[PDB]
Amino acid sequence: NAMYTITDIAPTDAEFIALIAALDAWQETLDLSQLPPQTVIALAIRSPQGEAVGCGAIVLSEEGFGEMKRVYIDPQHRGQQLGEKLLAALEAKARQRDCHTLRLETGIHQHAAIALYTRNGYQTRCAFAPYQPDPLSVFMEKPLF
């Protein structure tokens, strides 16, 4: 089963905020709403009930880079390739916006995410604006076409 659904979401949607809040509550083991809205791609994965169950986002720069962030899948829906489904969907949207390279930063603690990106062609790299090699952070990127 990946007969879940993918749809746009407002980063200001209560459902988005809830996934994000859960993401941040876990990382303990705001910012997306402010930005110019053209510059943000944000998506959700929904159960067949219609419950937002995962999400993620890409912030696009004017030189064709995109930064991937705020990716999370609710724990009860893991084990069945949703990260994959979502990731591909964010990439597809980034291409339609001429984005040529996706990069991301996550903590070294985030093993599931890190492996998901690796399984799909992201490769480790150095710090990029606006981060300074906080190590440990892990920076990754992938050429899209």
Side-chain angles (χ1 to χ4, degrees):
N1 212 351
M3 244 210 254
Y4 292 62
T5 225
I6 264 124
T7 67
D8 274 344
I9 20 87
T12 48
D13 197 311
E15 264 185 304
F16 189 71
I17 292 169
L19 300 153
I20 290 340
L23 177 61
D24 282 3
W26 177 61
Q27 293 169 351
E28 229 72 338
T29 333
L30 42 94
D31 211 339
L32 280 182
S33 33
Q34 342 268 180
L35 276 45
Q38 297 94 119
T39 77
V40 175
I41 292 156
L43 299 182
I45 338 152
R46 323 194 82 107
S47 80
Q49 295 61 240
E51 194 202 349
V53 93
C55 63
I58 289 168
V59 173
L60 309 160
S61 91
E62 50 194 67
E63 297 306 322
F65 296 85
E67 174 183 349
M68 193 162 297
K69 70 203 292 186
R70 309 317 226 148
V71 178
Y72 175 76
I73 303 303
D74 179 78
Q76 287 169 96
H77 293 81
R78 299 174 185 179
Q80 67 188 131
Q81 296 87 42
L82 298 189
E84 226 148 293
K85 181 150 177 142
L86 176 61
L87 179 63
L90 287 158
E91 300 179 341
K93 285 221 64 175
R95 287 185 205 100
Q96 283 149 43
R97 301 282 315 267
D98 295 335
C99 171
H100 57 70
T101 300
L102 262 193
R103 313 141 137 189
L104 60 88
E105 182 288 307
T106 26
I108 31 172
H109 298 323
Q110 294 178 76
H111 298 108
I114 282 167
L116 162 72
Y117 304 131
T118 318
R119 264 182 276 127
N120 306 100
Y122 289 77
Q123 316 220 243
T124 45
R125 84 188 288 280
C126 333
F128 47 91
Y131 304 114
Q132 246 95 38
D134 195 331
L136 284 250
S137 282
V138 189
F139 302 99
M140 317 191 66
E141 67 165 39
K142 182 189 181 167
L144 294 194
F145 318 130

Short mmCIF file of all heavy atoms in Angstrom, two decimals, residues 65-128:
data_model
loop_
_atom_site.label_atom_id
_atom_site.label_comp_id
_atom_site.label_asym_id
_atom_site.label_seq_id
_atom_site.Cartn_x
_atom_site.Cartn_y
_atom_site.Cartn_z
N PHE A 65 18.35 26.64 -7.07
CA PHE A 65 18.43 25.73 -5.94
C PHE A 65 17.10 25.72 -5.17
O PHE A 65 16.32 26.66 -5.26
CB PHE A 65 19.57 26.11 -5.00
CG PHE A 65 20.91 25.98 -5.65
CD1 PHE A 65 21.43 27.01 -6.43
CD2 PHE A 65 21.60 24.79 -5.60
CE1 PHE A 65 22.64 26.89 -7.09
CE2 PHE A 65 22.84 24.67 -6.26
CZ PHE A 65 23.33 25.72 -7.00
N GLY A 66 16.84 24.62 -4.48
CA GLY A 66 15.66 24.43 -3.68
C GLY A 66 16.18 23.84 -2.38
O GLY A 66 17.12 23.00 -2.40
N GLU A 67 15.65 24.28 -1.25
CA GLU A 67 16.01 23.61 -0.05
C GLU A 67 14.81 22.81 0.45
O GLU A 67 13.71 23.38 0.62
CB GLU A 67 16.49 24.59 0.99
CG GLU A 67 16.72 23.88 2.26
CD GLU A 67 17.14 24.77 3.39
OE1 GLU A 67 17.47 25.99 3.17
OE2 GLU A 67 17.19 24.23 4.49
N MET A 68 15.02 21.51 0.68
CA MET A 68 14.01 20.57 1.26
C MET A 68 14.05 20.56 2.79
O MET A 68 15.12 20.39 3.44
CB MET A 68 14.21 19.14 0.77
CG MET A 68 13.01 18.29 1.11
SD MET A 68 12.84 16.74 0.19
CE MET A 68 12.66 17.37 -1.40
N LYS A 69 12.88 20.76 3.39
CA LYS A 69 12.85 20.84 4.82
C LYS A 69 11.45 20.51 5.30
O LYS A 69 10.48 20.37 4.49
CB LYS A 69 13.29 22.22 5.28
CG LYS A 69 12.34 23.34 4.98
CD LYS A 69 13.04 24.72 4.93
CE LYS A 69 13.57 25.23 6.28
NZ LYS A 69 14.11 26.66 6.10
N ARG A 70 11.37 20.37 6.62
CA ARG A 70 10.12 20.05 7.29
C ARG A 70 9.47 18.81 6.81
O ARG A 70 8.25 18.78 6.73
CB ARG A 70 9.11 21.19 7.22
CG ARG A 70 9.58 22.59 7.64
CD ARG A 70 10.43 22.59 8.90
NE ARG A 70 10.03 23.64 9.82
CZ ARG A 70 10.14 23.48 11.13
NH1 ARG A 70 10.63 22.32 11.60
NH2 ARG A 70 9.72 24.46 11.97
N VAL A 71 10.24 17.77 6.53
CA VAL A 71 9.71 16.47 6.14
C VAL A 71 9.44 15.59 7.34
O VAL A 71 10.32 15.37 8.19
CB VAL A 71 10.76 15.76 5.21
CG1 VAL A 71 10.30 14.35 4.79
CG2 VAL A 71 10.97 16.62 4.00
N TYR A 72 8.26 15.00 7.41
CA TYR A 72 7.90 14.14 8.54
C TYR A 72 6.78 13.24 8.09
O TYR A 72 5.91 13.69 7.31
CB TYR A 72 7.35 15.02 9.62
CG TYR A 72 6.81 14.31 10.85
CD1 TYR A 72 7.69 13.77 11.84
CD2 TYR A 72 5.42 14.24 11.09
CE1 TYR A 72 7.17 13.16 13.03
CE2 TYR A 72 4.90 13.64 12.27
CZ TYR A 72 5.79 13.11 13.22
OH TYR A 72 5.32 12.53 14.38
N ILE A 73 6.79 12.00 8.58
CA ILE A 73 5.70 11.03 8.39
C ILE A 73 5.32 10.55 9.78
O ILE A 73 6.21 10.08 10.54
CB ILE A 73 6.20 9.77 7.67
CG1 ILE A 73 6.84 10.08 6.31
CG2 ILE A 73 5.12 8.69 7.64
CD1 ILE A 73 5.93 10.83 5.33
N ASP A 74 4.03 10.67 10.12
CA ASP A 74 3.54 10.14 11.37
C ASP A 74 3.90 8.68 11.57
O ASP A 74 3.49 7.84 10.78
CB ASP A 74 2.03 10.18 11.39
CG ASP A 74 1.48 9.62 12.67
OD1 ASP A 74 1.52 10.36 13.67
OD2 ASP A 74 1.06 8.43 12.71
N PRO A 75 4.58 8.36 12.68
CA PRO A 75 5.04 7.03 13.12
C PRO A 75 4.13 5.82 12.81
O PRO A 75 4.63 4.68 12.56
CB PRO A 75 5.16 7.22 14.64
CG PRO A 75 5.74 8.63 14.70
CD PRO A 75 4.86 9.37 13.71
N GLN A 76 2.83 6.04 12.80
CA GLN A 76 1.93 4.92 12.59
C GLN A 76 1.81 4.59 11.12
O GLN A 76 1.23 3.55 10.79
CB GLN A 76 0.56 5.21 13.10
CG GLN A 76 0.43 5.21 14.58
CD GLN A 76 -0.94 5.79 14.93
OE1 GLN A 76 -1.92 5.04 15.16
NE2 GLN A 76 -1.04 7.13 14.90
N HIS A 77 2.37 5.44 10.26
CA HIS A 77 2.23 5.24 8.83
C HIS A 77 3.53 4.89 8.12
O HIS A 77 3.55 4.64 6.90
CB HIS A 77 1.48 6.41 8.21
CG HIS A 77 0.05 6.46 8.65
ND1 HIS A 77 -0.33 7.00 9.86
CD2 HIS A 77 -1.07 5.93 8.10
CE1 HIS A 77 -1.64 6.88 10.00
NE2 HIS A 77 -2.11 6.23 8.94
N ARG A 78 4.61 4.81 8.90
CA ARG A 78 5.91 4.37 8.44
C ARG A 78 5.96 2.87 8.12
O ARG A 78 5.03 2.12 8.44
CB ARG A 78 6.95 4.72 9.50
CG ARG A 78 7.03 6.19 9.75
CD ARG A 78 7.94 6.48 10.87
NE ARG A 78 7.92 7.91 11.17
CZ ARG A 78 8.63 8.45 12.15
NH1 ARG A 78 9.39 7.66 12.91
NH2 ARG A 78 8.55 9.77 12.42
N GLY A 79 7.04 2.42 7.47
CA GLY A 79 7.22 1.02 7.14
C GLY A 79 6.66 0.62 5.78
O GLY A 79 6.65 -0.58 5.42
N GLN A 80 6.18 1.62 5.03
CA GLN A 80 5.47 1.36 3.75
C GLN A 80 5.71 2.41 2.68
O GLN A 80 4.83 2.67 1.85
CB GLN A 80 3.97 1.14 3.98
CG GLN A 80 3.22 2.35 4.47
CD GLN A 80 1.80 2.02 4.84
OE1 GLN A 80 1.35 2.39 5.91
NE2 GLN A 80 1.10 1.31 3.97
N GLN A 81 6.91 3.01 2.70
CA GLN A 81 7.44 3.76 1.57
C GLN A 81 6.77 5.10 1.29
O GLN A 81 6.92 5.62 0.20
CB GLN A 81 7.41 2.93 0.28
CG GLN A 81 8.31 1.71 0.30
CD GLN A 81 7.60 0.53 0.89
OE1 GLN A 81 6.42 0.30 0.59
NE2 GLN A 81 8.27 -0.21 1.75
N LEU A 82 6.10 5.70 2.27
CA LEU A 82 5.45 6.99 2.06
C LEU A 82 6.47 8.11 1.89
O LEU A 82 6.21 9.10 1.19
CB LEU A 82 4.44 7.34 3.20
CG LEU A 82 3.21 6.45 3.45
CD1 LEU A 82 2.28 7.09 4.45
CD2 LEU A 82 2.46 6.13 2.17
N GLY A 83 7.60 7.98 2.59
CA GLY A 83 8.65 9.02 2.52
C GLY A 83 9.02 9.16 1.06
O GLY A 83 9.05 10.28 0.49
N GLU A 84 9.22 8.00 0.45
CA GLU A 84 9.50 7.84 -0.97
C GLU A 84 8.47 8.47 -1.84
O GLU A 84 8.81 9.13 -2.80
CB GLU A 84 9.44 6.36 -1.28
CG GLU A 84 10.53 5.83 -2.10
CD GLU A 84 10.78 4.39 -1.66
OE1 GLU A 84 11.24 4.28 -0.48
OE2 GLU A 84 10.46 3.40 -2.42
N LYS A 85 7.21 8.22 -1.56
CA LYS A 85 6.15 8.73 -2.40
C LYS A 85 6.16 10.25 -2.37
O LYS A 85 6.15 10.89 -3.43
CB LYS A 85 4.81 8.14 -1.97
CG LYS A 85 3.62 8.58 -2.79
CD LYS A 85 2.49 7.48 -2.87
CE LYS A 85 1.27 8.01 -3.67
NZ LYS A 85 0.57 7.03 -4.58
N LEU A 86 6.26 10.79 -1.15
CA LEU A 86 6.30 12.24 -0.89
C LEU A 86 7.52 12.92 -1.51
O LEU A 86 7.41 13.89 -2.26
CB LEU A 86 6.29 12.53 0.61
CG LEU A 86 6.42 13.98 1.09
CD1 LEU A 86 5.27 14.89 0.59
CD2 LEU A 86 6.46 14.01 2.62
N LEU A 87 8.70 12.43 -1.15
CA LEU A 87 9.94 12.89 -1.77
C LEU A 87 9.84 13.01 -3.30
O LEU A 87 10.17 14.06 -3.86
CB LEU A 87 11.06 11.94 -1.34
CG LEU A 87 12.45 12.21 -1.89
CD1 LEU A 87 12.91 13.56 -1.37
CD2 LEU A 87 13.43 11.12 -1.48
N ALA A 88 9.34 11.98 -3.98
CA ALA A 88 9.23 12.04 -5.45
C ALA A 88 8.29 13.14 -5.90
O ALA A 88 8.44 13.72 -6.96
CB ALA A 88 8.76 10.74 -5.99
N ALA A 89 7.29 13.41 -5.06
CA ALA A 89 6.26 14.36 -5.42
C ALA A 89 6.79 15.78 -5.25
O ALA A 89 6.39 16.68 -6.02
CB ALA A 89 5.04 14.13 -4.58
N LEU A 90 7.68 15.99 -4.27
CA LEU A 90 8.28 17.30 -4.04
C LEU A 90 9.30 17.59 -5.15
O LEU A 90 9.41 18.72 -5.66
CB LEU A 90 8.97 17.36 -2.66
CG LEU A 90 8.04 17.42 -1.43
CD1 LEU A 90 8.76 16.93 -0.19
CD2 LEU A 90 7.55 18.82 -1.21
N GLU A 91 10.05 16.57 -5.51
CA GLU A 91 10.96 16.67 -6.64
C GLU A 91 10.16 17.02 -7.88
O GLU A 91 10.50 17.97 -8.62
CB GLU A 91 11.74 15.35 -6.84
CG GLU A 91 12.56 14.98 -5.63
CD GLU A 91 13.31 13.67 -5.81
OE1 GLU A 91 12.93 12.87 -6.69
OE2 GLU A 91 14.28 13.46 -5.06
N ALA A 92 9.07 16.30 -8.12
CA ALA A 92 8.34 16.62 -9.38
C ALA A 92 7.94 18.11 -9.37
O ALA A 92 8.14 18.81 -10.37
CB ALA A 92 7.14 15.67 -9.68
N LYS A 93 7.45 18.60 -8.24
CA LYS A 93 7.01 19.99 -8.18
C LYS A 93 8.18 20.97 -8.33
O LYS A 93 8.01 22.08 -8.88
CB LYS A 93 6.10 20.27 -6.97
CG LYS A 93 4.71 19.68 -7.25
CD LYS A 93 3.46 20.53 -6.83
CE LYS A 93 3.33 21.86 -7.60
NZ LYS A 93 2.05 22.62 -7.26
N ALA A 94 9.35 20.56 -7.87
CA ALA A 94 10.50 21.44 -7.95
C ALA A 94 10.92 21.53 -9.42
O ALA A 94 11.16 22.63 -9.94
CB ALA A 94 11.63 20.94 -7.06
N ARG A 95 10.95 20.42 -10.11
CA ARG A 95 11.23 20.51 -11.53
C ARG A 95 10.29 21.46 -12.25
O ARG A 95 10.74 22.20 -13.09
CB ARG A 95 11.18 19.17 -12.22
CG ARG A 95 12.33 18.31 -11.91
CD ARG A 95 12.31 16.99 -12.72
NE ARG A 95 13.07 16.01 -11.95
CZ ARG A 95 12.53 15.07 -11.16
NH1 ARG A 95 11.21 14.90 -11.12
NH2 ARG A 95 13.32 14.28 -10.44
N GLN A 96 9.00 21.45 -11.96
CA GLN A 96 8.11 22.28 -12.79
C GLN A 96 8.43 23.74 -12.58
O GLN A 96 7.95 24.60 -13.30
CB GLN A 96 6.66 22.05 -12.45
CG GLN A 96 6.10 20.76 -13.01
CD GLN A 96 4.99 20.17 -12.10
OE1 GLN A 96 4.12 20.90 -11.59
NE2 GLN A 96 5.05 18.84 -11.89
N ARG A 97 9.23 24.01 -11.56
CA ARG A 97 9.61 25.36 -11.23
C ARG A 97 11.08 25.63 -11.63
O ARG A 97 11.70 26.59 -11.16
CB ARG A 97 9.34 25.60 -9.74
CG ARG A 97 7.84 25.40 -9.39
CD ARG A 97 7.01 26.61 -9.80
NE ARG A 97 7.70 27.83 -9.40
CZ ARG A 97 7.50 28.47 -8.24
NH1 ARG A 97 6.59 28.03 -7.35
NH2 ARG A 97 8.21 29.57 -7.99
N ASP A 98 11.59 24.77 -12.52
CA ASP A 98 12.96 24.84 -13.05
C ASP A 98 14.04 24.61 -12.04
O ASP A 98 15.19 25.00 -12.27
CB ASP A 98 13.26 26.19 -13.71
CG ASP A 98 12.42 26.43 -14.95
OD1 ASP A 98 11.99 25.43 -15.55
OD2 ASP A 98 12.22 27.63 -15.31
N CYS A 99 13.70 24.00 -10.92
CA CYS A 99 14.68 23.84 -9.89
C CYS A 99 15.64 22.76 -10.40
O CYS A 99 15.20 21.71 -10.88
CB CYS A 99 14.01 23.39 -8.60
SG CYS A 99 15.25 22.91 -7.32
N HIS A 100 16.95 22.98 -10.27
CA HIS A 100 17.88 22.03 -10.79
C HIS A 100 18.65 21.20 -9.75
O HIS A 100 19.24 20.15 -10.08
CB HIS A 100 18.84 22.80 -11.69
CG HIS A 100 19.56 23.92 -10.99
ND1 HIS A 100 20.52 23.71 -10.02
CD2 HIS A 100 19.48 25.26 -11.15
CE1 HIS A 100 21.01 24.88 -9.62
NE2 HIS A 100 20.38 25.83 -10.29
N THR A 101 18.69 21.66 -8.51
CA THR A 101 19.43 20.95 -7.46
C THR A 101 18.63 21.12 -6.19
O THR A 101 18.19 22.26 -5.87
CB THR A 101 20.78 21.58 -7.24
OG1 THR A 101 21.53 21.53 -8.47
CG2 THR A 101 21.54 20.85 -6.22
N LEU A 102 18.39 20.00 -5.49
CA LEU A 102 17.78 20.05 -4.18
C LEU A 102 18.79 19.80 -3.14
O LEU A 102 19.50 18.83 -3.26
CB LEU A 102 16.76 18.95 -4.03
CG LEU A 102 15.37 19.42 -4.27
CD1 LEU A 102 14.51 18.31 -3.76
CD2 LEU A 102 15.14 20.76 -3.51
N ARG A 103 18.82 20.61 -2.09
CA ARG A 103 19.70 20.34 -0.97
C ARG A 103 18.92 20.26 0.30
O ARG A 103 17.83 20.82 0.37
CB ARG A 103 20.64 21.51 -0.79
CG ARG A 103 21.22 21.93 -2.02
CD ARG A 103 21.28 23.41 -2.02
NE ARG A 103 22.57 23.73 -2.55
CZ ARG A 103 23.07 24.95 -2.54
NH1 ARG A 103 22.31 25.95 -2.08
NH2 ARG A 103 24.29 25.15 -3.06
N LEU A 104 19.50 19.63 1.33
CA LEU A 104 18.84 19.63 2.62
C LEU A 104 19.86 19.58 3.73
O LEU A 104 20.97 19.08 3.52
CB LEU A 104 17.84 18.43 2.73
CG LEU A 104 18.56 17.09 2.57
CD1 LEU A 104 19.07 16.61 3.93
CD2 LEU A 104 17.76 16.02 1.89
N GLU A 105 19.46 20.07 4.90
CA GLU A 105 20.18 19.89 6.16
C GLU A 105 19.25 19.08 7.10
O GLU A 105 18.09 19.43 7.24
CB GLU A 105 20.51 21.28 6.74
CG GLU A 105 21.33 21.34 8.07
CD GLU A 105 20.55 20.90 9.35
OE1 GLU A 105 19.44 21.43 9.66
OE2 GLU A 105 21.09 20.02 10.06
N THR A 106 19.75 18.00 7.70
CA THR A 106 19.18 17.43 8.95
C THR A 106 20.25 17.08 9.95
O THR A 106 21.40 16.84 9.58
CB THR A 106 18.48 16.05 8.79
OG1 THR A 106 19.04 15.34 7.67
CG2 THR A 106 16.94 16.17 8.77
N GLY A 107 19.83 16.91 11.21
CA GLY A 107 20.73 16.43 12.26
C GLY A 107 21.22 15.01 12.02
O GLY A 107 20.54 14.21 11.35
N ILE A 108 22.41 14.72 12.57
CA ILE A 108 22.97 13.36 12.48
C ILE A 108 22.12 12.37 13.22
O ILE A 108 22.22 11.19 12.94
CB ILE A 108 24.36 13.17 13.13
CG1 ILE A 108 24.56 14.11 14.34
CG2 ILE A 108 25.47 13.14 12.06
CD1 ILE A 108 25.86 13.83 15.16
N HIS A 109 21.32 12.83 14.18
CA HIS A 109 20.43 11.95 14.88
C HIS A 109 19.32 11.37 13.99
O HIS A 109 18.67 10.39 14.39
CB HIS A 109 19.78 12.66 16.07
CG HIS A 109 20.76 13.11 17.12
ND1 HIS A 109 21.88 12.39 17.47
CD2 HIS A 109 20.75 14.20 17.93
CE1 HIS A 109 22.53 13.01 18.45
NE2 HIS A 109 21.86 14.12 18.75
N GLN A 110 19.08 11.94 12.82
CA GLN A 110 17.90 11.58 12.04
C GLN A 110 18.14 10.49 10.99
O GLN A 110 18.06 10.72 9.77
CB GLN A 110 17.27 12.84 11.46
CG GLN A 110 16.75 13.67 12.58
CD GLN A 110 16.15 14.96 12.12
OE1 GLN A 110 15.01 15.01 11.58
NE2 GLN A 110 16.92 16.05 12.31
N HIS A 111 18.38 9.30 11.52
CA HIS A 111 18.82 8.16 10.76
C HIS A 111 17.82 7.68 9.70
O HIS A 111 18.22 7.35 8.57
CB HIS A 111 19.19 7.01 11.72
CG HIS A 111 20.32 7.35 12.64
ND1 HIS A 111 20.14 7.57 14.00
CD2 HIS A 111 21.65 7.52 12.41
CE1 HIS A 111 21.30 7.87 14.56
NE2 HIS A 111 22.23 7.85 13.61
N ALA A 112 16.55 7.62 10.05
CA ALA A 112 15.53 7.24 9.07
C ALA A 112 15.54 8.17 7.84
O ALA A 112 15.51 7.71 6.69
CB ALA A 112 14.18 7.21 9.70
N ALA A 113 15.63 9.47 8.09
CA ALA A 113 15.52 10.42 7.03
C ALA A 113 16.75 10.30 6.23
O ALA A 113 16.71 10.32 5.02
CB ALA A 113 15.43 11.80 7.58
N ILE A 114 17.88 10.19 6.92
CA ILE A 114 19.14 10.23 6.22
C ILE A 114 19.20 9.05 5.26
O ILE A 114 19.65 9.19 4.12
CB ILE A 114 20.33 10.17 7.18
CG1 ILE A 114 20.57 11.55 7.83
CG2 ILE A 114 21.58 9.79 6.42
CD1 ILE A 114 21.53 11.51 9.05
N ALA A 115 18.74 7.89 5.72
CA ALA A 115 18.75 6.69 4.87
C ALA A 115 17.75 6.83 3.72
O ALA A 115 18.01 6.35 2.63
CB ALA A 115 18.47 5.46 5.66
N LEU A 116 16.60 7.45 3.97
CA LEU A 116 15.65 7.65 2.89
C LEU A 116 16.30 8.48 1.77
O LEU A 116 16.25 8.12 0.59
CB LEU A 116 14.40 8.32 3.39
CG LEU A 116 13.56 8.93 2.27
CD1 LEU A 116 12.91 7.83 1.48
CD2 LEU A 116 12.49 9.75 2.86
N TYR A 117 16.98 9.57 2.11
CA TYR A 117 17.55 10.37 1.06
C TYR A 117 18.62 9.63 0.32
O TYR A 117 18.67 9.76 -0.90
CB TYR A 117 18.11 11.68 1.60
CG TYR A 117 17.07 12.47 2.35
CD1 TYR A 117 17.37 12.98 3.59
CD2 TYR A 117 15.79 12.73 1.80
CE1 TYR A 117 16.42 13.70 4.32
CE2 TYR A 117 14.81 13.42 2.53
CZ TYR A 117 15.15 13.92 3.79
OH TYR A 117 14.25 14.68 4.58
N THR A 118 19.48 8.91 1.04
CA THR A 118 20.57 8.11 0.45
C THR A 118 20.05 7.07 -0.54
O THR A 118 20.61 6.90 -1.61
CB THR A 118 21.40 7.37 1.54
OG1 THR A 118 21.62 8.26 2.64
CG2 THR A 118 22.75 6.88 1.00
N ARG A 119 18.97 6.38 -0.16
CA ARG A 119 18.29 5.41 -1.03
C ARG A 119 17.78 6.06 -2.32
O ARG A 119 17.50 5.35 -3.30
CB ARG A 119 17.09 4.76 -0.30
CG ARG A 119 17.36 3.41 0.36
CD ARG A 119 16.08 2.85 1.02
NE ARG A 119 15.84 3.37 2.37
CZ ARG A 119 14.72 3.96 2.82
NH1 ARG A 119 13.64 4.13 2.04
NH2 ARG A 119 14.67 4.39 4.07
N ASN A 120 17.67 7.39 -2.34
CA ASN A 120 17.15 8.09 -3.53
C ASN A 120 18.07 9.16 -4.13
O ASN A 120 17.62 10.17 -4.67
CB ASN A 120 15.73 8.60 -3.31
CG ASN A 120 14.79 7.49 -2.87
OD1 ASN A 120 14.48 7.35 -1.68
ND2 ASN A 120 14.35 6.67 -3.82
N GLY A 121 19.36 8.92 -4.03
CA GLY A 121 20.31 9.67 -4.81
C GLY A 121 20.83 10.92 -4.20
O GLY A 121 21.59 11.61 -4.84
N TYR A 122 20.44 11.24 -2.97
CA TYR A 122 21.06 12.38 -2.29
C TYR A 122 22.43 11.98 -1.82
O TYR A 122 22.61 10.84 -1.46
CB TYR A 122 20.22 12.85 -1.10
CG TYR A 122 18.98 13.51 -1.57
CD1 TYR A 122 17.91 12.75 -2.03
CD2 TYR A 122 18.87 14.91 -1.63
CE1 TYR A 122 16.74 13.37 -2.53
CE2 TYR A 122 17.68 15.55 -2.14
CZ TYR A 122 16.64 14.76 -2.58
OH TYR A 122 15.49 15.29 -3.10
N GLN A 123 23.39 12.90 -1.83
CA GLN A 123 24.74 12.60 -1.40
C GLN A 123 25.23 13.61 -0.40
O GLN A 123 24.88 14.78 -0.50
CB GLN A 123 25.68 12.64 -2.59
CG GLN A 123 25.18 11.97 -3.85
CD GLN A 123 26.27 11.22 -4.54
OE1 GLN A 123 26.63 11.54 -5.65
NE2 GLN A 123 26.84 10.23 -3.85
N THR A 124 26.04 13.18 0.56
CA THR A 124 26.50 14.12 1.57
C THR A 124 27.33 15.24 0.91
O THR A 124 27.93 15.06 -0.17
CB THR A 124 27.33 13.43 2.69
OG1 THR A 124 28.25 12.54 2.08
CG2 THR A 124 26.46 12.61 3.61
N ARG A 125 27.33 16.41 1.53
CA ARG A 125 28.12 17.53 1.02
C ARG A 125 28.40 18.46 2.20
O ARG A 125 27.97 18.20 3.33
CB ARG A 125 27.35 18.25 -0.08
CG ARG A 125 26.40 19.23 0.49
CD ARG A 125 25.52 19.81 -0.52
NE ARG A 125 26.33 20.69 -1.34
CZ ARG A 125 26.69 21.92 -1.00
NH1 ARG A 125 26.30 22.46 0.16
NH2 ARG A 125 27.44 22.62 -1.82
N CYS A 126 29.13 19.55 1.96
CA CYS A 126 29.42 20.56 2.98
C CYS A 126 28.24 21.48 3.21
O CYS A 126 27.36 21.57 2.36
CB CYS A 126 30.57 21.48 2.52
SG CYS A 126 31.70 20.73 1.40
N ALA A 127 28.28 22.21 4.32
CA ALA A 127 27.44 23.39 4.57
C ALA A 127 27.16 24.26 3.34
O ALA A 127 28.05 24.44 2.52
CB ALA A 127 28.08 24.23 5.65
N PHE A 128 25.94 24.79 3.22
CA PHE A 128 25.58 25.78 2.20
C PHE A 128 24.80 26.87 2.90
O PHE A 128 24.26 26.64 3.98
CB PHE A 128 24.73 25.16 1.07
CG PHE A 128 23.56 24.28 1.55
CD1 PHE A 128 22.31 24.80 1.76
CD2 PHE A 128 23.72 22.93 1.73
CE1 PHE A 128 21.25 23.99 2.20
CE2 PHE A 128 22.66 22.11 2.16
CZ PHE A 128 21.42 22.66 2.39
#
